[PDB]
Paper text:
We solved the structure of DsHpsP from D. shibae DFL 12, which shared a substantial amino acid sequence identity (68%) with RpHpsP from R. pomeroyi DSS-3 and also possesses enantioselectivity for S-DHPS. The crystal structure of DsHpsP showed that four monomers, each containing two Zn2+ ions, constituted a tetramer in the asymmetric unit. DsHpsP is a member of the medium-chain alcohol dehydrogenases/reductase (MDR) superfamily, with a Rossmann-like fold domain for co-factor binding and a catalytic domain harboring essential catalytic residues and a metal atom. Loop 1 and loop 2 exhibited a rather constricted channel in the ligand-free state, but displayed an “open” state, with movement apart, upon binding of NAD+ and S-DHPS, suggesting a gating function for these loops in ligand entry. In the “open” state, the C3-OH of S-DHPS formed hydrogen-bonding interactions with His59, Glu60 and Glu139, as well as coordinate bonds with Zn2+. ICP-MS analysis revealed the presence of Zn2+ and Mn2+ in the protein. These results indicated that metals play an essential role in DsHpsP’s catalytic function. Site-directed mutagenesis suggested that His59 functions as the catalytic residue, as mutant His59Ala completely abolished the catalytic activity for S-DHPS. Glu60Ala and Glu139Ala displayed weak catalytic activities for S-DHPS, implying that Glu60 and Glu139 probably play roles in binding S-DHPS. The chirality-center C2-OH of S-DHPS could form a hydrogen bond with Glu139 and a coordinate bond with Zn2+, and these interactions disappeared when R-DHPS was replaced with S-DHPS at the active pocket, due to steric hindrance caused by the reverse chiral direction of C2-OH in R-DHPS. Moreover, the essential residues His59, Glu60, and Glu139 of DsHpsP from D. shibae DFL 12 were conserved in RpHpsP. Together, these suggest their common enzymatic functions and mechanisms, in which the interactions with C2-OH of S-DHPS determine the stereoselectivity of HpsP.
Numbering used by the authors:
A (entry chain D): -9 to -8, -6 to 327
B (entry chain A): -10 to -8, -6 to 327
The structure:
Amino acid sequence: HHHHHSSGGMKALVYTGVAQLAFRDVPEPVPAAGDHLIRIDSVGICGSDMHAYLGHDDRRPAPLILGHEGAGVIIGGPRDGERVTINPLVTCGTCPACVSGRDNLCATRQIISMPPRDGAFAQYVAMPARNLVTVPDDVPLEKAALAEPVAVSWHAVRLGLASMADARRDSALVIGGGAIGVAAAISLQAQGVADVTLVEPNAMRREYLARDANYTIATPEQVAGRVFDITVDGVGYDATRAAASAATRPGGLLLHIGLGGGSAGLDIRRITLQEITVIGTYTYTAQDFRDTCAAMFDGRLGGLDWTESRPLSAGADAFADIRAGRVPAPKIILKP
Amino acid sequence: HHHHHHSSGGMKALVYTGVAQLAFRDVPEPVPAAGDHLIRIDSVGICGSDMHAYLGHDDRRPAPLILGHEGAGVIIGGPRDGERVTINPLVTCGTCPACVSGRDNLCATRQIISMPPRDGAFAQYVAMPARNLVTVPDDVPLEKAALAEPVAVSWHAVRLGLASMADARRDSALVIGGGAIGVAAAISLQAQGVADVTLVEPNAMRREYLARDANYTIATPEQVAGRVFDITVDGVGYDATRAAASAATRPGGLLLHIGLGGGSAGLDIRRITLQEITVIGTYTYTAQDFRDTCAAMFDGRLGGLDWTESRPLSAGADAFADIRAGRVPAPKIILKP
Ligand SMILES: [Zn+2]
Ligand SMILES: [Zn+2]
Ligand SMILES: [Zn+2]
Ligand SMILES: [Zn+2]
Ligand SMILES: [Zn+2]
């Protein structure tokens, strides 16, 4: 088998200062004991990358490689040339959270792009075998790199549905036209809730999404005063929490994924007098990641185009375009 | 030959006439509608919603109003004359989607006794539908059976919460509040198989009263500071209690919110998110929960249910004064019409 016994450099987009991304040479990673070297084909930009880029992220400082939405090809060893998409969350397998099958809550949970783990905004990453899912030949690595953002919302929806105190699952309202919102919308339709409305103020993304949206797309005003069995706040501001509160039917589900900001917004009185199940969600179980990949690859989660690509060398420029709010697509995929 | 009230004069009721004004006066006897019973009230508990209305804080409860919704008593007239009953005060339609779903506590046209248009049970008599009445066996005092409604509130929350949890880890529970809603949560948790229950109450007089018959741990907030529990129950429902329940809930655990203190913040939203806490606000009880509560009360699964002191209805105004002045060691006063 071909090996990397000696290494040189690889290209990476490194976060060097607030709103500053430099495309430069960094050392190629050394795989640990039971780890594979992944040549990154596609790595998507996430709300956590944006948050760390604007200097808002407390835990992600200094020089740092961001990005945790990676798909690519194993280099060297008996799985050389194998096409895989990466689960970036590494879990201890032995804490109470893991043993009940809620590894998303592991006490020592690490993600790629979260020190001490470098991010996937680079030509190569080192990853344990158990964090890799094989991508069939008929699925582009560019669609497979959506595994992680889809898996966040898939986890929310599965856990939410299973947590509901009744079987009345007719209506869902997803708040936010970002990647989280779309993932929630397509997860809700794949998991058997057909009547899904996504609500988004931005006319541009409404048109983008309406291309191949199997679910209803609307503006806040077209759903004013309506109530739904299920609400998904994919944005997570006070305003969006307030909106989700008002739009959840009595006995209904309010899923809170987005991490916008604020410590309020929930109508405590409505949630008590109308008995609303409110569930905050974090990432996904390893089994959710695998289920998500399975549902993508067999076509249950729609066309998965809601993407535009850019070279890693143009990463910085791509961040500016999201900031200025001029990306019609809800996801930018970088190409090392 | 069944006894009847074909003619009626007045009865005694304790009437909310204005802010902090309770007037023990003559009011009309209620005339039961078609499929309803007249109940002569033996025992009626004072709730937080009564004190809220008495202080002028309730927009839905102005004018002259008879408060109270925690009643037990005797059927008067007809074939059930003399039957001891405890009253489910929440009247539900039985045919709306919530009712058909089995969640009749969320009935779209739900009415509760003490919320207009339905007069409360702070009176010698109430009129209630037969489906809202649970028979009390002679070995259960009406003073203990009048706890059914406040115990059904927490029993319902506990059952809903346990059923809704995302994992089968129910080892430990914190109850915040040594009021009736808190004591009811602690006993309901133990009867539903969470053995390890800690109730937290800052007031020493209340803790001491609760220690008479506590099968759960009674403690100060400081004695549990920094600990996390599978299950937290906010039986108070201020911002401070919502914060304390947020902090004390373990990742993936359950935070039940029952209290109606006030405020619309306190919940640590970013921890509920990052640590995936299931947060459930709860309202009253299903008709089935109320029946289930009564059954467990009557067979002794919910402890001695002796955590009450009683006052004649004629002294209701003094009783309200005592509660307001933090003068009441017991977590429940039962008024005696
Ligand atoms: Zn992501
Ligand atoms: Zn673990
Ligand atoms: Zn009550
Ligand atoms: Zn109904
Ligand atoms: Zn007194």
